[PDB]
Structures are given as structure tokens and as C-alpha cells.
Amino acid sequence: VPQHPQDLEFTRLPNGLVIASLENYAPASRIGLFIKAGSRYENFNNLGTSHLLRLASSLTTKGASSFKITRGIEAVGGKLSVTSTRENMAYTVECLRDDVDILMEFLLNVTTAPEFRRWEVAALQSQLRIDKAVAFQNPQAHVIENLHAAAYRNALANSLYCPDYRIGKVTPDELHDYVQNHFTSARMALIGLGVSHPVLKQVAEQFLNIRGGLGLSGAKAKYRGGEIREQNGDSLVHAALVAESAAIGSAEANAFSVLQHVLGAGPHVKRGSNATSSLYQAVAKGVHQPFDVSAFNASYSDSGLFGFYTISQAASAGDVIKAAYNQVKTIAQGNLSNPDVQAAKNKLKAGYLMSVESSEGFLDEVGCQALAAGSYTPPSTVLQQIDAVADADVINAAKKFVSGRKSMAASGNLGHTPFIDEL
Amino acid sequence: MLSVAARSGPFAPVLSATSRGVAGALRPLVQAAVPATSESPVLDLKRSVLCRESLRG
Amino acid sequence: INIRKTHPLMKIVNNAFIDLPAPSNISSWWNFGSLLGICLILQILTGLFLAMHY
Amino acid sequence: TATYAQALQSVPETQVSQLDNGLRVASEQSSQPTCTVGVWIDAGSRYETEKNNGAGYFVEHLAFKGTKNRPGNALEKEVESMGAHLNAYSTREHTAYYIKALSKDLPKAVELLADIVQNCSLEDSQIEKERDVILQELQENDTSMRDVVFNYLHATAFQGTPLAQSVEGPSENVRKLSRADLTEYLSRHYKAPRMVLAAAGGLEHRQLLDLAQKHFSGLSGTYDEDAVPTLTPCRFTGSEIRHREDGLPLAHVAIAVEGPGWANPDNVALQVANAIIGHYDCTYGGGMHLSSPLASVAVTNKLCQSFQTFNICYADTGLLGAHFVCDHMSIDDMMFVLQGQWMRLCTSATESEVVRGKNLLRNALVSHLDGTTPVCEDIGRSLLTYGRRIPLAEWESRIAEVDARVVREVCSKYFYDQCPAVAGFGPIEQLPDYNRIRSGMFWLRF
Amino acid sequence: MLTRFLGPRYRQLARNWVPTAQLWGAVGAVGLVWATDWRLILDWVPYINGK
Amino acid sequence: WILVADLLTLTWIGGQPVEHPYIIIGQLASIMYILLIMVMMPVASIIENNLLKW
Amino acid sequence: VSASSKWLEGIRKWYYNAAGFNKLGLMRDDTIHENDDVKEAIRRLPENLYDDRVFRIKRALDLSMRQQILPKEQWTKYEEDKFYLEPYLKEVIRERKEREEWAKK
Amino acid sequence: VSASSKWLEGIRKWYYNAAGFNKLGLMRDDTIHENDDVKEAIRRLPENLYDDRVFRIKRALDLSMRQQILPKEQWTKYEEDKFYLEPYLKEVIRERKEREEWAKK
Amino acid sequence: SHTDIKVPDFSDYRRPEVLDSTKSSKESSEARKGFSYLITATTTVGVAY
Numbered sequence A: 001v002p003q004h005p006q007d008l009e010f011t012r013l014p015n016g017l018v019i020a021s022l023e024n025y026a027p028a029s030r031i032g033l034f035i036k037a038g039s040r041y042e043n044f045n046n047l048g049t050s051h052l053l054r055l056a057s058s059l060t061t062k063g064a065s066s067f068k069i070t071r072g073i074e075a076v077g078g079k080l081s082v083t084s085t086r087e088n089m090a091y092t093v094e095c096l097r098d099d100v101d102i103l104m105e106f107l108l109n110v111t112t113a114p115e116f117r118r119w120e121v122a123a124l125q126s127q128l129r130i131d132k133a134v135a136f137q138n139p140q141a142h143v144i145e146n147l148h149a150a151a152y153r154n155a156l157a158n159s160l161y162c163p164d165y166r167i168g169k170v171t172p173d174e175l176h177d178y179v180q181n182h183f184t185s186a187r188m189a190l191i192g193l194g195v196s197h198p199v200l201k202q203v204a205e206q207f208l209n210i211r212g213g214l215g216l217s218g219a220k221a222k223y224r225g226g227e228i229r230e231q232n233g234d235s236l237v238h239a240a241l242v243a244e245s246a247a248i249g250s251a252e253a254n255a256f257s258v259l260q261h262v263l264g265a266g267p268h269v270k271r272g273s274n275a276t277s278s279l280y281q282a283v284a285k286g287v288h289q290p291f292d293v294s295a296f297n298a299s300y301s302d303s304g305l306f307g308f309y310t311i312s313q314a315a316s317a318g319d320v321i322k323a324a325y326n327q328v329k330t331i332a333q334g335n336l337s338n339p340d341v342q343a344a345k346n347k348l349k350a351g352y353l354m355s356v357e358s359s360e361g362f363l364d365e366v367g368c369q370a371l372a373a374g375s376y377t378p379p380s381t382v383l384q385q386i387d388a389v390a391d392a393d394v395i396n397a398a399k400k401f402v403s404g405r406k407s408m409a410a411s412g413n414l415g416h417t418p419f420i421d422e423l
Numbered sequence B: 001m002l003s004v005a006a007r008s009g010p011f012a013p014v015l016s017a018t019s020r021g022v023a024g025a026l027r028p029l030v031q032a033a034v035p036a037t038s039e040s041p042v043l044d045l046k047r048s049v050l051c052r053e054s055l056r057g
Numbered sequence C: 001i002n003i004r005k006t007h008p009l010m011k012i013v014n015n016a017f018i019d020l021p022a023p024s025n026i027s028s029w030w031n032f033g034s035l036l037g038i039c040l041i042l043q044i045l046t047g048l049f050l051a052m053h054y
Numbered sequence D: 001t002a003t004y005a006q007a008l009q010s011v012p013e014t015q016v017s018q019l020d021n022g023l024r025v026a027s028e029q030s031s032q033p034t035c036t037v038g039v040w041i042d043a044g045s046r047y048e049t050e051k052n053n054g055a056g057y058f059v060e061h062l063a064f065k066g067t068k069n070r071p072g073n074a075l076e077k078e079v080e081s082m083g084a085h086l087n088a089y090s091t092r093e094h095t096a097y098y099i100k101a102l103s104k105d106l107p108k109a110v111e112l113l114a115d116i117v118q119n120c121s122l123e124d125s126q127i128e129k130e131r132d133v134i135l136q137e138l139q140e141n142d143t144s145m146r147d148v149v150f151n152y153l154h155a156t157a158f159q160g161t162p163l164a165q166s167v168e169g170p171s172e173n174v175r176k177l178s179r180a181d182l183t184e185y186l187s188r189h190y191k192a193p194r195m196v197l198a199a200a201g202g203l204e205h206r207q208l209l210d211l212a213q214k215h216f217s218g219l220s221g222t223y224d225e226d227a228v229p230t231l232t233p234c235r236f237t238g239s240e241i242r243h244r245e246d247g248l249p250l251a252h253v254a255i256a257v258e259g260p261g262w263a264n265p266d267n268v269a270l271q272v273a274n275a276i277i278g279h280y281d282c283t284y285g286g287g288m289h290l291s292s293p294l295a296s297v298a299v300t301n302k303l304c305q306s307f308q309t310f311n312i313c314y315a316d317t318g319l320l321g322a323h324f325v326c327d328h329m330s331i332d333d334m335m336f337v338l339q340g341q342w343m344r345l346c347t348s349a350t351e352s353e354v355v356r357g358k359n360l361l362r363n364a365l366v367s368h369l370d371g372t373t374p375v376c377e378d379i380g381r382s383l384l385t386y387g388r389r390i391p392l393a394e395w396e397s398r399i400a401e402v403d404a405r406v407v408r409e410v411c412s413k414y415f416y417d418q419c420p421a422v423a424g425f426g427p428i429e430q431l432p433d434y435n436r437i438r439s440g441m442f443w444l445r446f
Numbered sequence E: 001m002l003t004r005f006l007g008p009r010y011r012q013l014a015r016n017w018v019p020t021a022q023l024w025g026a027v028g029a030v031g032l033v034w035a036t037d038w039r040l041i042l043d044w045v046p047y048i049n050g051k
Numbered sequence F: 001w002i003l004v005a006d007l008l009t010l011t012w013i014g015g016q017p018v019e020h021p022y023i024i025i026g027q028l029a030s031i032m033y034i035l036l037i038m039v040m041m042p043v044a045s046i047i048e049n050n051l052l053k054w
Numbered sequence G, H: 001v002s003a004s005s006k007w008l009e010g011i012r013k014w015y016y017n018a019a020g021f022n023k024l025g026l027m028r029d030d031t032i033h034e035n036d037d038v039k040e041a042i043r044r045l046p047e048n049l050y051d052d053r054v055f056r057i058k059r060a061l062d063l064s065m066r067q068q069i070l071p072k073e074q075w076t077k078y079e080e081d082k083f084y085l086e087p088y089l090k091e092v093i094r095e096r097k098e099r100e101e102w103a104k105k
Numbered sequence I: 001s002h003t004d005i006k007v008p009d010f011s012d013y014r015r016p017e018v019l020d021s022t023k024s025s026k027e028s029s030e031a032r033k034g035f036s037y038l039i040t041a042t043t044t045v046g047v048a049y
């Protein structure tokens, strides 16, 4: 038995830096840094410089040689990647606890020590084009990701890639500026897992001072709702039709998560009729062929939308998508069971469970705690807050979704598809 | 008390040099695997995927 | 890289004998050729040595 | 702290047990509030015999197909309404089936597991229809062509020879699918004594035995009769073929040299060796600084579009080696790389890398041990093959014992002067002859 | 610039090549023998004694 | 040009049959060849380098 | 290029009035014999610079063929010469000292 | 490839039982010595055809090396041979007759 | 749709040692390449003379 198992220490640096040492007695090493540098903080002054930087960790560093850095990184042979999110960019090192300091040093370097070398940068450029290649690549990178690119619409769609028209144009001015403009203690979140809150505090102190963030959530990112319309010639059509949800942290946010579960998503047990949803069960009763619809969460603190990602062959798109809306209408009827509600709470709440879970999808989930939670409203309290599940707002919500301007998204030719004005 | 993550099958890229890239982000879209003629490819001007390193005690 | 690929004089060489792609169907019609040169070489060779005394 | 080994001890201890069939039940009881409830469905990819072709893939398509104790949508009701998890991951001799659940739910799916264990039905409706969904869904469902790549490495570069035998079996068989394959050869195959009672999560092993008796009991009791031969060693194919494609736009190339399988004691360092090998990722950056010297020149020369050390498994043998991607060029120097690197390997050892890939297997070592399902299945094949579990300090022991003398030598022992797998995909002309490429299998570097 | 290949690394490299080095060396030497059959060494050769 | 001096120097040196002065003469000329090239020329090179300062 | 360096770098100034370089108005850095390090060194050179050294070089060839030289006035200003590469170059000296370094490692 | 043409094209049938081609199962058209006209002629060839002539050709090489031949049964069916190119080819004969024609013009 | 291929029988060409699916060339190879290597060296040592 550990001396009573260490409770992860949540804190904020007195400086206004997010100071998080989650004491983990676990054997391995998990090192997060959550950055407001995620796409939200991004700006139209630049393009893909986060796609870039996302590549550019390897770049020539101030006081650290990307080859020498590569020698230490390459040396321990551990896990260091900053993570690309709309909210954050996260410097991650999972490794043997020993090199942590070096890692930390590397970390300290990685974060704080860009040289942004012209020569180096220029070189780096092409690897991006490679990157965008990966980005758009395959029905995951294409029909999911490029049809994320063909799905994701707003400044969240400000890409994990860059713009084509922007191609090759990055500036080192835009580097030192960009971080100087973007990178900041405003973006500063440090999260230890496995280490000494004291030691993390040690390097943290002697190292990490910064500041300097900026303004706003979007145009209301211009709410076109409506189509991002894409002629594809996709063979089997890839169309995805966008309902909406609610903002991050919104009171109803959780409720939106319900509605998600209500229509549900991919099953925990494979190979099934998708028997579980009016979007699915009534895609089951409704639909006879390949189809998918699901709700996103594009969660600003400010706003949000949960669409339906959709999949089907062209012929039924009017048929299906209309039926989609139809089922949506049908759904918005407010007809629901109680076992719908509870067994939902089982399904989705379990969502929070595996969603919270284990050593990697700990570091990615309990590391979406060790980064992305911020406290435990425990599976006690957050699943109390989850137990705070309440159905009616899903009815009035059914209206609410029915009530807005939402988006449609097009991959294909609409010759069989609806255009949503003709809806 | 600060939250980023988990809704399964959307995209918020994760990439590195040591590693490779990916985005599994919040929201779905992964459900398509069902039909007959389940086919699937390789061999022409492409990328693929899937690596990792995992071992033991 | 591969010096076989790399070395310029070799670059000829591989291009000449070694790396040389050649019809697989190839037939015994061949042999004589190298023979002759071998012959020729020996020819010279001997003649030479022959010359040496003669 | 208590160092990686005394952390390895400090990493808590899993436990295992043997239920009375001789039935096998092992426990990792954890803080996992959910859990991976392995009912480890032990019917794998290679476990099957010649005319038995496809019956396990069909069985896979049959695995969730619905049953009596729980009907199909009912299986979806207890199960799906429960919002639970099921997979079938099929391997040479064994496989698994996950259940993700509230540890609270622990009994329920166990119950489900049992009928899974038993009540899976061949329904002349399903057997017509779900098996029109098998005849169809399967029938055309085949064609995955990375399984014509990676399983060209398996369905080709792994031969189909009785031991090399492929997985899916014939489309002629697809027509020829039988209840005799299911009515009979499900039973005529499926044999519980080998099935795995697999415990991952927060859990009570005492309760494990309990519910075992409660439901899981009464399984292997009916078992045996005839037909249980062993593996008669022989040679896998030993060849190459280009599916000859102008249509293959760019090589998806590859190669491999022994990958793990179940058995041999050597693969330990071979693991480490494969580490020294390593996988050169296209998406990977940093080639200028790349560790695998191969990888390096590959960057400098821009010498290929991918290579990934890929370990192909059979008890005591296999092939572990690079995937690859390339244009009209690379392959030649690639082997000059690869085999030469191997040659380089077979000679050139420096402890540095040895320690490096040691740390590789350490980190990675977590990454298997780390993770709930990875640990889960890890238990599954762990006893399946092993019957033991290399303890954290056992695997860290032979691991700890790692010896670079055995690198030079043992390298020579397994590696030297052989003919392991190489498979590109596409216009392979840079594939030299066995009289060249596999002349390249030999070293004039000395 | 011997320091270039002078390091415990390349040192170890030598430690590797050494036995082989003996081998190829022997190859050369014996070659000189049989090729030459030079009387100087030839004498010691028993039953390779040619008279 | 100095080395050259050593050279055609060596000529006229040979330009005499074996002679008292010559003995020493060429005797030094060799040193030159060894110096004026192997030493004095290389030594020179190093020197010029030092001067270079750039 | 001044008296110590008009004697010494006045092998490059007074005695490259004699050995030509600076009185030919050459670029000090440009005098480095081309090597690999030199090569990629230049590959990393600055652009406006690149043009500059270009015009310098070509011109040098020009009078060279002409076997003439610029006005002794036009002959280059002594001292007063940016060391063009030397920050960049010398940086690379550290580079190949670095590749050379971990190389040593 | 039948008796007149098993004597005559039975230099290609009975006497390419003797001269080998058709008893080797060759492709009549394929026998044309490669020429430029032949060249681009094939360049225009039909696809499924192209495969066919390919397998034919390779196989021919195969037994050739093997210095064997297929079963005399497997030896090609007489007559009963599409003239593969000859529409395409002969078309080209008109082509080079056309380039050749206005050429004459 | 793509997986259906198969391969032929080497027996007619097969040397004896490989006849069985029963046993490992773990024994055989060194003997086979041995015999050949022998022959080769015969050609090297003789040719040397």
C-alpha cells in the first residue's frame, strides 16, 4: 500500500501559470504541458503555423541543436510530442523517470528555446506538404479527415494542415512573433504525472516564467450554419449533415452529451445493427445500407454544435438525409423511455468511464485528466454531475436543435442528395 | 477544472517526428466498417499507419 | 551509397558487365564473344610474351 | 525510486489461478472501475487445418451472429443495451473477446460470456441469412490488400503451407461453407480446455472462481476425443512474387526477418535486435538526425518512402522487418541497407544502441504493460503461449541479462546466411534475384 | 586526426575486426607461400618436401 | 619558384660529373626537396595559414 | 586589411596588392577554398549576400580575363570588410563540430 | 493454321510444328519482327489484349529456357486464331500509309 | 475479393532432404549449402593450382 495513495495536486502558479503536479506513484513517466496555443488562440495573421510548429518541435532550437536535441530525444528514446488541439498544444514526455530532468530540460528547451532558423525553416517547409498529404490521405484521412477538412468548417477547421494559398509562406518573423504573439503563460499549463511536485516545482520555478495571451472566440464563427458544400465524385458518397449542440462548460453541455448518447455513436461491441438509436435503430428500421450520423461537440466556452457525421451511397442521400431530418423530427417528438434515459446514462456515462481511463488513455484520458480534466469532480462528483442527468431538457433540447441554423456538409454530387434549401 | 478531450473518432491532430501523426478527437465518424465486399487496399502511392512500441516488465 | 552504384569508373563497370540488365532468354550463341576477347587477350598475351623473346 | 526493477516489483503483482476443469482463470484486480472483461475468445487466425479453412473466420462472422439464450437483438439488449464491448482478435493458436464494463457489471457479461461460450447457434435462418450475411458479407468481404501487403506478408510472404497456412481459406470454401463446419466443425473444433478465463480490471479472483462455478463452470468437461496434432517443422514458401502491377502506383514495399511467434528463448534479444532494427516511419520526421543509420541515408539519399520493422510470428520462428515504400529505385540499396545493415548488424555491434533499444523495450515495455487491454491480452497470450507470465523483473531479468556478445554471436546464430521474408508491393524490378537479392543474402563485405 | 576513429567506439570496432584481421592476414601469408614456394620458407615444409 | 630553383638546380647539379663542391651541393638539394616540399613547402603552408587571420 | 594586416592580411592587402585578392577587391570570405563544409555553408548563405558575392565573383572573373584590375581607388577599401560568412560559416564550424561532436560521442 | 496453312502457315503449323511458333502456341501477330511501325502499333494495342500477348510472350520465354514445349494438345489450336493486331495493325498500315500518303503529297 | 491465390508443388524439382513437412531444415540447410559450398571450393582450390 502506498502511503495513502497520492491525490494528484492541482494548483495554479502564483504567477498566473497553470501549475499542476499530479503526484503519480505509478512506475512510468507522464509529462503534460497544456497550451492555450491550441487552435482557439490561433489568428488569421498566420496559417498552419500550428500545423507547422506541430512539425517544428524538431526545429533548430535556441541553445539546443535540433540534431543535439535529437541526440537527447533520440538518446533516452522516450515519448515527447506536443499535441494539436483546438484548445491546446501539449508537450508530452512519457519515459523512464530518470531522464525526466533531461526530458524536463529538453522540455524546458522544447518549450522555451526555439531558434527558428531561417535555413532550417525553409527546409522544414516541404515536410509540411508531406504532412497535408497525410492529413487528407485516406478515408480516415480523407473521408473522415479530408472530409474533416470537408467536414470541419470554422476556425476549428483552421487546419492541422495549413492553407494551400498560404503554402510555403511561413516567416521566422511569424515564428518569434507567433509564439511571442501566441505563446505565453496564458497558454501555460504544466502537468506532472509520476514526479515530485517539489521537483517539478523546482525546474518549474528556476525556468518557466512567461505571459501574453489575446482575445476572442470567433465571428460567432460566422454562423453560416448551412453547407460547407463539396463536390466530390466520391464513388460511394461521403456526406455529413450537421446538427448542433451547446458550448463547453454550458449547463446543458452534459445534456448535449446525453442527446449524443440518445442518437449514440460507434458501439463498444462491434458488428451490430446499430440497434440503439432513432438515429440508428431508426437508421436500422430506416436505412438498409451503409450510413452513419453522429453528433459532434465543437465546444467553445462560447458556443457549440453537434452535427451528424453521415455516410452512405449517393442514391439514398435525399432518402437518408431527409429520413435523417425526418427521424430528427421524429426524435424531436419528445417520445422517449425512462430506460432510454437511464440505460443511456449507463452507455454514455460509461463513456466518461473508458473516456477517463487507462495508462495511455490515462495519459490521453486520465491524461485528459493529467492534462484535460483540471480536477476530479470525481466519477463521484462528475458522475454525480453526470447523475445530474435530466431528461426534459433533452426534450426542449430536441426542440432547440430543431430550432437553429445548423450546417450541412457535402462530399459528392447532390444529384441524389438534398441541398438543404430544397430540404 | 480544465478540459480538452474524448468523444471518439473526430480529429484534433496528434503528430511527432519520433512518432507519426493522427487525430482521434472528440466526436464520432468511425462506424463505416460494415458491408460485404469488405475489400481494402495497399500498393499504390500511399501512406498507411498503425505503428507503436509496447513490451513487458 | 552502394559504391557499385557510386564509383564512376565502376559506374561504367556495373553498367558494363555487372549491373547490366540483359535478356533472360539468352542463348549459348553467346559464348564465343568473350572467348574471342579472352582469345584476343591471350592472343596479345602470348604474342606479347612471344614478342618478348621472338 | 525503487528503481525500474524495484519499481517493477513496486509495480504490483498480478495473480493467476486454475479452475477445476484444470480450467484456467487469471486475475489482475485493479482500480479499474470499468474493466476489460476478457472472455478471451481463443479461436485464432492460424489455429485451423486444411479443409477447415475459413471456419474460424466464418465463426468470427458467426461469433456475435446471435444465439438462443440471448437472441441477436437480445444479445444486443443485455449487451448493447448494457452498452458493453465485444471484440474478436484472432491469432495463430488463440484469440480473445473483450468486454468493457462497469466492474459493477462484472457478473452480467460473464453470464453472457457463458452463452457466448455455449449458446452460439447456427440458425438455418441466420445460417441462411446472417450466413447470407456470411456468404455475402464474408464472401466479398475478403479483399483487404494490405492483407495483400502485410498479409502479403501473411497470406503471401507468410506462405499458406500447412504450417505456413493462411487465415481466411478458399472462396471455393466460401461457397462450400458447412454446418458440418459449424454444426460439426465448430464443435468439431471449438474445445474449451484451451479457452482462456481472462481477468482484467478491478475484480475479485475469489469471486472469479465463484462465478466460474456459477456460470463459467461446466465447459471443458466435454472435450478431447481425437485430432490434436503438433507442428511438424518444414520450410515456409521461401520465394517472392510480384502481383505484377503497372497499376500499383508506388511500391508499398516491405521485408521481414524473424518475428516473434510463441516460443523460442532467443527472440528476447531478437526483440532487442529488432529494436536495433527499428521501423522507419514515413510520417516520422527528423531523418537528418535519424537513429537507424539506414533511416539516415534513406533521408539523405531520400532513399525510400517507408520502412517499418514488422515482426511476423510463429512459435519459434517468423519474420520481423520493414514495410517500405519506394519508386522505381530503392529496393536494391534497401537490402544493401537492410541485409547490409543486417550484415552491419551481424558485425558492427556497439553497446550504445544495445542500451538504447534496451530503453526502447523499457518504454514500450510499459506501453504493453501500460494499458488495460494491452495488459489484458498480454495476460491472454502470456499464459496461452507461456502458461507463465514473464514477471516485471523476469522480463526485466532476461531483459536485464541482455548481452551484446550474444548480439554478435546469437545474431550470427539466428541471423546469418538465411532467406527470410521480403515483400514489396508493385513493380518490383529492383527486386534482384534470389541469385542476386539472395545472393545479397550472403556477404562479400567479407 | 586519428582521434576521428580514436574512441572507445571505434576502439571497440577494432576489437571486433581483430580476429578476422588475423584471418585475412593468414590468407595473404600462406598465399605468398604456396604461390612462391620460396625456398626460404619452403625448407621447413615436411612432406611438402619436394626432394 | 624557389622549389623550382631547387629543381633545375638539381639539373645543373647533375650537370656536373662527380665533384667536390657538387657532393655537398646536391647533398643539400635533397634536403630542400624534402624541405622545400615536404617541410618548407608544408611548413610554409601552415605559416601562410597563420598569417591569414581570416 | 591594415598595416599589420596590410603586411600580413597584407599578403591580402599590400601583398595582395601583390597576391591580388583585396586589391582585386575580392571578398575575404570568398577566398576559402571550396569544401563540403564550405559547400553547404554557402548553401545556407544569406540571399542579398548571395547576390553580392555573386557580382563580386563574376567581376573578378571579368577583369581576370581582361587581365586588368579596378582603379587602385576602386581597389577595395582596406579593413572595413564585413566578415560575411564568418558568423554563418563559423556557426557551421560549430555545426560540423556538432555532427562532429555527437559524432565523437 | 490448317492443311494448306498447315503446310504453309504450316511452316507455322505443321512446319512450325517444325519451325515451332504455333505448336509452341505462339501468337501469329506477335511474330512480326519489331519495327517502329510495329512499335507504336503495339503502343496503340488493346489492353486486355496487351495482357494476353504478355502472358503468351513470357511463357514462350519460359519453355524456351526450359527448352520444352507445351502438350501437343496444349500446342495451339489450329486455324481458330484471331488476328489480333491485324485490324489494329493494318489500320496502322493505313496510318503510315497516310503519314506516308500526304507525305507523298 | 483479392485473397484467393495459391502456389505449386516443388516436389519434382525437390531434392530429398526437404521432402517432409515433418522436419526442420534447421538441420538440412547447413548440409545443403555445405555440399554446394564444397563443390564450389573444389572448383576454388583446384583452380588455384
Ligand code: HEM
Pocket: C040, C043, C044, C045, C046, C047, C048, C050, C051, C054
Ligand atoms: C598484339 C598481340 C600480338 C602480338 C604481340 C603478336 C606477335 C606475334 C609474333 C611475334 C609472331 C611470330 C612468332 C610465332 O609465330 O610464334 C606471331 C604469330 C602469329 N600470331 Fe600474333 N600477335 C598478336 C595478336 C595476334 C592476333 C590478334 C592474332 C589473330 C588471332 C594473331 C594470330 C597470329 C598468327 C596467325 C601468327 C602466325 C602463325 C604462327 O603462330 O606460326 N596474333 N604473332
